[PDB]
Every structure is written in C-alpha cells, then in structure tokens.
Amino acid sequence: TLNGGITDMLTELANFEKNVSQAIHKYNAYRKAASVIAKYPHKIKSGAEAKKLPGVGTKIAEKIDEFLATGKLRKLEKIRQDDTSSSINFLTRVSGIGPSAARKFVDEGIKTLEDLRKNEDKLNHHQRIGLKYFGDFEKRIPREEMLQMQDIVLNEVKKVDSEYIATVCGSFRRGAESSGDMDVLLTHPSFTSESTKQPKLLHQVVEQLQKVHFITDTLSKGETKFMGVCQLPSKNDEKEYPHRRIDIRLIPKDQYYCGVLYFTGSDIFNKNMRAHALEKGFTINEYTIRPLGVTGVAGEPLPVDSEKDIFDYIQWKYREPKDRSE
DNA sequence: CCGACGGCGCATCAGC
DNA sequence: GCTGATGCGC
DNA sequence: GTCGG
Ligand SMILES: Nc1ccn([C@H]2CC[C@@H](COP(=O)(O)OP(=O)(O)OP(=O)(O)O)O2)c(=O)n1
Ligand SMILES: [Mg+2]
Ligand SMILES: [Mg+2]
Ligand code: NA
Ligand code: NA
Numbered sequence: 476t477l478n479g480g481i482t483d484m485l486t487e488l489a490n491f492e493k494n495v496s497q498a499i500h501k502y503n504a505y506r507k508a509a510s511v512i513a514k515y516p517h518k519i520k521s522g523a524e525a526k527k528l529p530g531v532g533t534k535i536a537e538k539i540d541e542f543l544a545t546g547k548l549r550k551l552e553k554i555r556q557d558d559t560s561s562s563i564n565f566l567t568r569v570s571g572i573g574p575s576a577a578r579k580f581v582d583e584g585i586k587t588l589e590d591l592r593k594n595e596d597k598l599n600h601h602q603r604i605g606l607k608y609f610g611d612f613e614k615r616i617p618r619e620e621m622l623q624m625q626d627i628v629l630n631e632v633k634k635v636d637s638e639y640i641a642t643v644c645g646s647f648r649r650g651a652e653s654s655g656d657m658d659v660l661l662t663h664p665s666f667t668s669e670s671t672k673q674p675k676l677l678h679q680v681v682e683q684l685q686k687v688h689f690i691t692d693t694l695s696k697g698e699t700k701f702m703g704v705c706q707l708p709s710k711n712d713e714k715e716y717p718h719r720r721i722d723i724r725l726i727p728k729d730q731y732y733c734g735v736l737y738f739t740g741s742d743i744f745n746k747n748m749r750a751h752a753l754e755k756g757f758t759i760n761e762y763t764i765r766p767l768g769v770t771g772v773a774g775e776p777l778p779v780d781s782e783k784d785i786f787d788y789i790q791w792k793y794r795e796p797k798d799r800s801e
Numbered sequence: 802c803c804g805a806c807g808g809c810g811c812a813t814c815a816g817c
Numbered sequence: 818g819c820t821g822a823t824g825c826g827c
Numbered sequence: 828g829t830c831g832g
Binding site: 570571572573574575576601645656658694695700702722724737738740742 | 823824825826827
C-alpha cells in the first residue's frame with residue numbers, strides 16, 4: 476500500500492480483460508503494470524511519472540491520471556454497471572470456471588451462487604469442488620498456519636519415503652505473511668531426467684496425505700502434478716480451519732534448481748525472467764535452461780548447480796526469494 | 802508502424 | 818484408442 | 828496494453 480488505489484484499479488481492469496474480453500495480452504499488460512507499480516517506493520503523483528516504469532504505458536497513464544484526480548475511473552464504473560460483466564466476474568471466481576464456461580453458463584441462465592448450487596450436475600468435478608469451497612478458496616492462509624501444514628506434508632512424506640524431498644514453494648518460499656495457497660515441490664532419487672520414472676511416487680504420497688485426512692478433495696492429478704484440497708486438523712471443540720488449495724508438483728531430482736526457481740515464482744517474476752532470458756539468447760523452463768537464438772530452435776540444456784547459475788547465464792544478480800513478487 | 806507476448810500439466814472433446 | 822485442440826490451471 | 832525491432 477502506497478499506490479494501492481492504483482494497483483487495485485489495474486487489477487480490476489485486468490480481471491475484466493481476461494474474464495469478459497478474453498483479451499489475455501491486455502490482462503498481462505495490466506498485471507505487470509500493477510506489479511511494477513507495487514514495488515515503486517514512492518506515492519505516484521502522475522501518469523507521466525508512472526510511465527517511466529517498464530510496463531506502464533500511455534493508456535495506463537491517462538487512467539492513472541483520471542484516477543488520481545477523481546479517485547475513480549469511469550470505464551471501471553461503467554463496467555461495474557454491466558450485468559453480463561458482473562456475472563462473468565462472479566462465475567470466474569469459481570475454480571474450474573473460466574471465460575468460456577462462464578459465458579455459456581450465463582447463456583443457460585446459471586448466474587448466481589444460487590443457480591449454481593442447484594445445478595451441480597452441470598459442472599465438472601473441478602467446478603463442483605470449487606462451488607463447494609467457494610468462500611474458503613477466497614481466504615488467505617496466514618503464515619503460522621502455513622508453518623503447520625508444512626510440517627505435516629513434510630512429516631507425512633518422510634513417512635512414505637525417507638528419500639522423498641518436499642519443499643514449500645510459491646509465496647510461502649518468498650517469505651510471505653500469508654499465502655494464497657500451498658505449493659509443494661517434491662523429488663525422489665528414483666525419478667530423474669532419464670528415469671523409468673515412477674507414477675507410483677506422486678501417488679503414494681498423495682495417498683498418504685489422504686489417509687491422514689490432510690487431503691480432502693482432488694482437482695486433478697497426473698503422474699507429476701497433483702491439484703486438490705487439504706485442511707488442517709482442528710482441535711477438540713475448536714472450530715475447524717477453512718479448506719485450502721494445495722498443489723504438489725513432482726520434479727526430476729536433478730532438475731530441481733530449475734524446478735524450485737519455477738515453483739517459487741512469482742508468476743510475474745518468472746514471466747519477466749523467462750523473457751529476459753530469450754533476450755539473452757536463452758529459454759528457461761522448470762527443467763532446464765537452454766540456448767535459444769537466431770533460428771528460434773533451442774539447444775541442449777546447459778548445466779546448472781544452483782538457482783544462481785540460472786541468473787548468471789542471463790546476466791542477472793541473484794535475487795533471493797523475498798525479491799520475487801515481480 | 803507491427804509482431805509478440807513464458808512455458809508447460811491435466812481435463813475434456815472431436816476426428817479419425 | 819490416439820492425437821491434437823482447447824480450457825483452465827500452476 | 829506495452830515493448831522492442
Ligand atoms: N501463471 C503462473 C502462475 C503460477 N506460476 C508459478 C508461480 C509460483 C508457483 C505457485 O503459483 P501460485 O500458488 O499461483 O502463486 P503464489 O506466488 O504461490 O501465490 P499465492 O500466494 O497466490 O499462492 O507457480 C507460474 O509460473 N505461472
Ligand atoms: Mg501459491
Ligand atoms: Mg498454488
Ligand atoms: Na513505461
Ligand atoms: Na476460476
């Protein structure tokens with residue numbers, strides 16, 4: 476907060492473009508812009524001044540201006556009155572529900588938490604579990620709770636296989652005071668860039684979190700990526716914790732540093748980082764960094780021994796996690 | 802003025 | 818069934 | 828919507 480009023484607006488605008496407009500570049504434009512301005516250590520006084528930031532542009536600057544002058548932005552207000560827009564916006568807040576579902580659902584008359592609650596049969600497993608946890612999904616997990624769950628997945632994993640190694644990523648890793656969700660990066664000897672790779676691995680751990688009731692519901696699950704719900708065990712007579720999204724990604728043991736870099740994000744930060752890499756003649760993914768130039772065809776992965784080596788290749792000072800919001 | 806925008810997992814559907 | 822696309826997601 | 832060619 477400094478320029479919260481600004482970032483908010485951009486955020487709203489970005490939500491619009493993405494849910495309603497289905498103009499994903501404009502969505503990306505708005506968020507980068509909001510993240511840069513969020514790091515900005517001064518209270519912006521004008522658009523021009525914002526313009527000096529990378530990602531802030533001419534339009535966004537006129538807006539910031541009407542904004543600073545009126546405390547508002549018409550276009551937002553006016554969007555705010557559109558009904559089709561409010562439904563989509565509402566619907567898209569349901570996990571599993573995105574731009575196209577929300578429009579067909581709107582088209583078919585489903586448009587409120589009510590319409591939804593009586594039409595579970597028209598949803599997919601995904602959206603049904605999302606409907607189910609609708610407000611919980613919207614709550615911030617505070618840090619002390621994060622410390623509790625970590626402890627659990629960790630302790631649980633050890634139990635399945637001493638060898639497994641799980642690490643809590645996303646906003647947590649970035650030292651946040653409250654996450655949004657739980658992101659678990661996991662590895663095991665047995666599965667490497669050239670392994671006879673075991674689907675047993677993600678499975679047995681998922682299983683183990685189940686039997687312990689940590690894990691309550693499943694959103695998706697492949698042989699390397701699991702996406703579901705978990706929850707902390709409540710004390711006698713104490714009212715239970717909300718349900719949380721938890722993501723567990725299984726990574727080749729060996730491509731760990733690329734793995735952790737990726738899962739720690741931010742998403743904006745990675746977006747920015749991967750881009751700079753291209754610039755620099757590279758192409759970074761969760762597995763490897765590879766040379767990629769002129770012909771556009773990439774080459775063999777360069778060796779890496781730390782997250783650091785990935786910043787090195789691209790000419791960037793190491794940015795510890797706390798510095799990853801963008 | 803204009804092409805490109807990070808890179809990839811899992812679910813679902815149609816084509817065959 | 819498989820392959821490719823599209824949705825929605827991290 | 829912006830950026831960089
Ligand atoms: N479009 C995205 C979204 C996410 N990720 C990466 C960023 C880190 C990891 C975890 O993602 P989230 O849990 O969505 O984000 P977070 O930074 O952990 O934030 P939150 O507190 O909202 O979970 O996935 C990404 O590369 N690209
Ligand atoms: Mg997260
Ligand atoms: Mg997550
Ligand atoms: Na700018
Ligand atoms: Na959604």
